[PDB]
Write a protein that binds this ligand. Structure first.
Ligand SMILES: COC(=O)[C@H](C)[C@@H]1N=C(c2ccc(Cl)cc2)c2ccc(OC)cc2-n2c(C)nnc21
Ligand SMILES: C[C@H](O)COC[C@H](C)O
Ligand SMILES: [Cl-]
Length: 111
């Protein structure tokens, strides 16, 4: 049984995965497939891949012991995107928008 704070985190996660945000969330649904995408330098540049399916698995498996650990993974996901891609690329604009959704709701965390 998740703590109250981790319940809030799980709610955020469900929201990020919902159809409401799909237009900009979809690149983050699954691990980057570097070979499929032709980005053969991705794993040289990104040492700690992260994506929402992995966050979801970790939540289901009770891997996260607190909200801070959850938030660090979601933010790592966005950071990888900002690290690999030029700041004016489409996928970066999507990341910024999804991160806005995440940060404003994470800020509503019950004490
Ligand atoms: C050539 O650069 C790319 O393809 C990067 C690696 C890729 N761009 C994208 C990307 C490029 C253009 C648009 Cl409009 C949306 C996403 C990408 C696409 C699919 C995907 O999972 C299936 C992950 C993507 N992703 C993420 C997350 N962070 N960077 C990307
Ligand atoms: C767009 C920045 O990379 C992240 O900003 C988060 C803010 C809550 O929109
Ligand atoms: Cl953090």
């Amino acid at each position: 049984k998740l703590s109250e704070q981790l319940k809030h985190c799980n709610g955020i996660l469900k929201e990020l995965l919902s159809k409401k945000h799909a237009a900009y969330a979809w690149p983050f649904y699954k691990p980057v497939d570097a070979s499929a995408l032709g980005v053969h330098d991705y794993h040289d540049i990104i040492k700690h891949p992260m994506d929402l399916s992995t966050v979801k698995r970790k939540m289901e498996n009770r891997d996260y012991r607190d909200a801070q650990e959850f938030a660090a993974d979601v933010r790592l996901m966005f950071s990888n995107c900002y690290k690999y891609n030029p700041p004016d690329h489409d996928v970066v604009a999507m990341a910024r928008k999804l991160q806005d959704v995440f940060e404003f709701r994470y800020a509503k965390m019950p004490d």
